[PDB]
Design a binder for this molecule. Structure first.
Ligand SMILES: [Mg+2]
Ligand SMILES: [Mg+2]
Ligand SMILES: [Zn+2]
Lengths: 41, 97, 49, 94, 160, 177, 38
RNA sequence: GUAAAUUUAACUGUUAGUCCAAAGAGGAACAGCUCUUUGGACACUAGGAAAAAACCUUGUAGAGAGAGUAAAAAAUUUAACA
């Protein structure tokens, strides 16, 4: 019954990620005590 | 002692080849952040404590400069738009997942 | 699908990057050896007939 | 029920309370909240990744724009992991 | 005693990249065997959920999961709601492990099960050609046939 | 990740404050990597319409280094449009007047020439010396590695390496030197 | 000085020196021999 | 190796032409000049040489959120002489 109009994205998934969607802190190492760069402590 | 990549930011990658040599098996368990690497969570006598509700009305200029400083943008994003564009906007956009 | 894995399957993409880096290192090793050393585990080519 | 989140179907108020209750009833030390990751902080658009640890073992992690909402999200993630209704769980068999 | 070929350490006496030594083949092969056995026992036990696959189909590569939908730009000679097996699986993976074909994984190892659920036409597409000052103008309207397939299941078997 | 939808979107599209150091670095390489970060081309979710730029905080911009004779060759040209507004200043003069202008101009040139360039420049932050405002320092994440390697002047060499490098020739005993 | 493309020594006291990126013929006894490469 | 050719019948339209390579002529061994010949391309598509007629890559038509390629990015820093 759906309209025959333009269909974006010729694929529809509801679970696009299984290992966790990328965020900037993926592939980012952690640091001792979580110190910021040039932190005086 | 040989690792293709540093093994300390996303997952512990271990590559392997099956005996027939026809397929590659990758073992990648996640790397968890150490507790040691984390950081702890940061922390009128006579009258009411009257709620301090002041909202100074800024005229359009200084208002837009304050917003631009706050969000690190320029003024053009904040200046308004006309009825033509305002009506051309789709108010019921398609929404997938 | 490489971009799809880079965005949605970061661990799988890291595995792929590790495999490619290993293949590059094996290529460098073969080039420097220049002899008839064993071809390399992941440098082996599956043949079809 | 195919493609919705646990707390999108079943609304809850205090995930931290539910989480500490579950940990207590399965004999686990109370979770400690810690700032695993942080970006910004002085700006109007900060990012806080708060991790919930138990006995110095990370049990959950959650992002947010404020530390409090990030901690609440981490609590919800821990609840999802504990009840098994997680995103990467085994899909239904038809 | 300097070897006949010793170069004093300068900025460019040696290549800038770090020296890399690859693992020896024998120990590395036994390591591969252990890793493959570990992944196999993970599969046997069932320590996975929500598999995903990269599948070749209709000249395309699709990253699909279970309960998925894909739109194929042609008719497929199949009645509606018909279950078929997608077979050319370039990749299958889950959390903590993934399997890579060279270039295709063995059919004994993984099955993709899909279902034809719709046979439709695309929205009308416009092909207009125009060349100026030469009176050149053509218009055509096309509707490519299409097939909507639902990915039902991705299954793996212990075979490594 | 089992995150909720809104926090997941926020985490994916959040902005990151990178730190970069001048101090004997080429302005061009600094600008190249800073421009990549400002455009957001380092993110795999990048798209020109997704507003995925990141903040770049560059410091010691007063202590950059130019290869060759660029300090005296390179000429920056501008025109105040009044008849005779054509001014041309060498890199030395421009650096002496403004200590961040050179790096700013390099990044501006490397950025894409569209309407997002000024927004990216607004997210870029430059500082001529070691001092950084406290709010920015509290925002910072990830000091990126420097492109150049600072070739380590002779007096900075240790005695171990000084004596480990062989002496190449035998001088005559009778030369004044 | 005289501008020249090809510099020539006209005296035995003439000497060539490269200063400011250009070659010069300087002569202390016959200053008419001063030449500047162009 | 190929598949076109000649004849018969019936006619229209083109007959104010440009660059490039090559062999020449005129002119200044000037011209985005003029005149012949041989061959391309343009007066039809697409990619490249910044924009682009004539240079280079490429032709036979549609859809694709696939893939392999074609052409395709200028290099150079010089004067001591008993
Ligand atoms: Mg002509
Ligand atoms: Mg064709
Ligand atoms: Zn002289």
């Amino acid at each position: 019954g759906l309209d025959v109009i333009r269909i974006r994205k010729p694929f529809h998934t509801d679970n696009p990620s299984i290992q966790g969607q990328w965020h900037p802190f993926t592939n980012k190492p952690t640091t001792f005590r979580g110190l910021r760069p040039r932190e005086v402590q | 002692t040989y690792s293709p990549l540093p093994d300390d930011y996303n997952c512990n990658v271990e590559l392997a080849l099956t005996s027939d040599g026809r397929t590659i098996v990758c073992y990648h368990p996640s790397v968890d952040i150490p507790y040691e690497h984390t950081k702890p969570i940061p922390r009128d006598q006579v009258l009411k404590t009257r709620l301090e509700e002041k909202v100074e009305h800024l005229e359009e200029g200084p208002m837009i400069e304050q917003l631009s400083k706050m969000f690190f943008t320029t003024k053009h994003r904040w200046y308004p738009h006309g009825r033509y564009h305002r009506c051309r906007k789709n108010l019921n956009p398609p929404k997938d997942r | 699908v490489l971009a799809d894995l880079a965005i949605y399957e970061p661990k799988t993409f890291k595995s792929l990057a590790a495999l490619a880096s290993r293949r590059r290192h094996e290529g460098f090793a073969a080039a420097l050896g220049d002899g008839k050393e064993p071809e390399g585990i992941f440098s082996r080519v599956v043949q079809y007939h | 029920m195919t493609g919705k989140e646990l707390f999108e179907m079943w609304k809850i108020i205090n995930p931290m309370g539910l989480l500490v209750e579950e940990l207590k009833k399965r004999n686990v030390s109370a979770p400690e909240s810690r700032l695993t990751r942080q970006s910004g902080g002085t700006t109007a658009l900060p990012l806080y990744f708060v991790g919930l640890y138990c006995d110095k073992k990370l049990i959950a992690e959650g992002p947010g724009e404020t530390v409090l909402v990030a901690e609440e999200e981490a609590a919800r993630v821990a609840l999802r992991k504990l009840y098994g209704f997680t995103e990467n769980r085994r899909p239904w068999n038809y | 005693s300097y070897l006949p070929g010793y170069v004093p350490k300068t900025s460019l006496s040696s290549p800038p990249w770090p020296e890399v030594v690859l693992p020896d083949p024998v120990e590395e092969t036994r390591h591969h065997a252990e890793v493959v056995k570990k992944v196999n026992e993970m599969i046997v036990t069932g320590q996975y959920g929500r598999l995903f696959a990269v599948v070749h189909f209709a000249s395309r590569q699709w990253k699909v999961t279970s309960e998925d939908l894909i739109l194929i730009g042609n008719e497929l000679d199949l009645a509606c709601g018909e279950r078929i097996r997608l077979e050319k699986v370039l990749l299958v993976g889950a959390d903590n492990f993934t399997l890579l074909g060279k270039p295709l994984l063995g059919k004994d190892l993984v099955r993709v099960e899909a279902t034809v659920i719709e046979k439709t036409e695309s929205w009308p597409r416009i092909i207009m050609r125009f060349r100026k000052r030469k009176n050149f103008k053509k218009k055509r309207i096309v509707t490519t046939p299409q097939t909507v397939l639902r990915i039902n299941s991705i299954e793996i078997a212990p075979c490594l | 990740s089992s995150f909720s939808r809104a926090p997941q979107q926020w985490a994916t599209f959040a902005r990151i404050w990178y730190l970069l150091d001048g101090k004997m670095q080429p302005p061009g390489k600094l600008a190249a990597m800073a421009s990549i970060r400002l455009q957001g081309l380092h993110k795999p979710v990048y798209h020109a319409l997704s507003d995925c730029g990141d903040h770049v905080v560059i410091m010691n911009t007063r202590h950059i280094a130019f290869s060759g004779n660029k300090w005296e060759q390179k000429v920056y040209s501008s025109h105040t449009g009044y008849p005779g507004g054509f001014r041309q200043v060498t890199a030395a003069q421009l650096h002496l007047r403004d200590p961040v202008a050179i790096v700013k101009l390099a990044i501006y040139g490397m950025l894409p020439k569209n309407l997002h360039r000024r927004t990216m420049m607004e997210r870029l932050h430059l500082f001529p010396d070691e001092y950084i405002p406290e709010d920015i320092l509290k925002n910072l994440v990830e000091e990126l590695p420097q492109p150049r390697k600072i070739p380590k002047r002779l007096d900075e060499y240790t005695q171990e390496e000084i004596d480990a490098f062989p002496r190449l020739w035998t001088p005559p005993e009778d030369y004044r030197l | 000085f005289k501008n020249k493309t090809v510099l020539k020594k006209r005296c035995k006291d003439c000497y060539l020196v490269k200063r400011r990126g250009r070659w010069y013929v300087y002569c202390k006894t016959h200053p008419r021999h001063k030449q500047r490469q162009m």
